[PDB]
Amino acid sequence: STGSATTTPIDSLDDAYITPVQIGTPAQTLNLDFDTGSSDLWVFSSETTASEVDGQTIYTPSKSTTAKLLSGATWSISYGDGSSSSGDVYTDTVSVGGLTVTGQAVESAKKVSSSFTEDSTIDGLLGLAFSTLNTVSPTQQKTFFDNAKASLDSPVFTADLGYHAPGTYNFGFIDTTAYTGSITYTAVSTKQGFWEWTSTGYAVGSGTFKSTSIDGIADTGTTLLYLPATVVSAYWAQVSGAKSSSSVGGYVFPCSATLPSFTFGVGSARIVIPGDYIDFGPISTGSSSCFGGIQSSAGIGINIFGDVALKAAFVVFNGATTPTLGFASK
Ligand SMILES: O=C(CCNc1ccccc1)Nc1scc(-c2ccccc2)c1C(=O)NCc1ccccc1
Numbered sequence: 339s340t341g342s343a344t345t346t347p348i349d350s351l352d353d354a355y356i357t358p359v360q361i362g363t364p365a366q367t368l369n370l371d372f373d374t375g376s377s378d379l380w381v382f383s384s385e386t387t388a389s390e391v392d393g394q395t396i397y398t399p400s401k402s403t404t405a406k407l408l409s410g411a412t413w414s415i416s417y418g419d420g421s422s423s424s425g426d427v428y429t430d431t432v433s434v435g436g437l438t439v440t441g442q443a444v445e446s447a448k449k450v451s452s453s454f455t456e457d458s459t460i461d462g463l464l465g466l467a468f469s470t471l472n473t474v475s476p477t478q479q480k481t482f483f484d485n486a487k488a489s490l491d492s493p494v495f496t497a498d499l500g501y502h503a504p505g506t507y508n509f510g511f512i513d514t515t516a517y518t519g520s521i522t523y524t525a526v527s528t529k530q531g532f533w534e535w536t537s538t539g540y541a542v543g544s545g546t547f548k549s550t551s552i553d554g555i556a557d558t559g560t561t562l563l564y565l566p567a568t569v570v571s572a573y574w575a576q577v578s579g580a581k582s583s584s585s586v587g588g589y590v591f592p593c594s595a596t597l598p599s600f601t602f603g604v605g606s607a608r609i610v611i612p613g614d615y616i617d618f619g620p621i622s623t624g625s626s627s628c629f630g631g632i633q634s635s636a637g638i639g640i641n642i643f644g645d646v647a648l649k650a651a652f653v654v655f656n657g658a659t660t661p662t663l664g665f666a667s668k
Contacts, residue, residue, distance in 0.1 A: 341437025362402030373559030393458030
């Protein structure tokens with residue numbers, strides 16, 4: 339089997355991407371944030387505290403004839419950025435772009451934090467990291483990809499995120515027309531439950547490539563590119579007027595200043611992020627100071643190849659016996 343779904347930016351800044359997902363019988367379609375940095379499929383629901391729902395589409399398990407409650411089961415997640423959610427657990431039929439999994443754990447939110455409430459465009463998350471991170475208790479539940487894997491033509495999914503444009507998540511096949519040149523595959527460590535890999539280095543603009551190992555994760559659920567302070571300082575030093583602002587919580591730059599590209603290494607291959615992918619616009623409405631898309635990982639404790647990086651590439655999440663990651667230019 340295979341599946342193919344369009345993923346769309348939630349706003350003009352590409353802050354996140356949503357993908358339609360069918361849950362239950364008859365189908366209830368919710369727009370979920372596919373997140374390769376976590377492993378829970380959770381949704382706004384009829385059980386969500388009413389004051390914490392503001393415009394989201396909700397899943398109503400009582401109206402699904404295929405929904406089954408896991409009696410006593412709970413889930414609770416705290417994301418790296420402080421946000422959180424928790425609730426109980428059902429199994430139900432879940433389909434993405436034509437690909438169907440029966441018995442998928444659908445985690446119904448009783449509570450969500452303020453950032454989730456304030457974002458009306460995201461109805462939940464669909465985790466695509468390794469299932470060892472899944473928070474369901476007493477029995478850990480598998481991700482949608484893990485459940486579908488055996489049935490897929492090939493045990494893989496791909497992320498093709500657009501810049502200010504729609505893109506595609508494919509399951510079970512590699513669309514050879516979606517990228518240029520070849521796909522370079524690189525080793526993955528699953529020790530932390532992430533699609534964790536080691537980049538071979540970086541360049542800023544037309545500068546010389548610096549060979550250096552950067553361990554980080556391929557994370558579609560994180561907007562920005564978070565790298566070591568030394569690397570980030572080298573990037574913003576090439577931007578006139580750029581400063582790290584303690585009040586804003588990272589690097590900002592004069593909105594009209596030219597942004598150089600940022601190149602990262604995948605083995606001997608190179609992925610080039612165009613300068614404008616790094617522009618996240620005025621820090622507040624009407625300001626001529628703009629937020630930067632490359633930031634230090636020093637406070638986070640882990641380097642993150644988020645949407646800013648991934649959307650410059652066609653990315654293969656290869657779930658073979660020994661998982662690997664593939665990157666191609668496009
Ligand atoms: O990048 C984000 C959230 C992006 N989503 C978004 C939605 C609406 C408006 C704007 C943005 N948050 C960050 S920054 C850095 C991390 C992080 C990840 C792993 C480990 C340490 C830090 C996360 C994060 O927690 N991402 C998961 C997430 C969070 C909230 C919503 C969706 C996904």
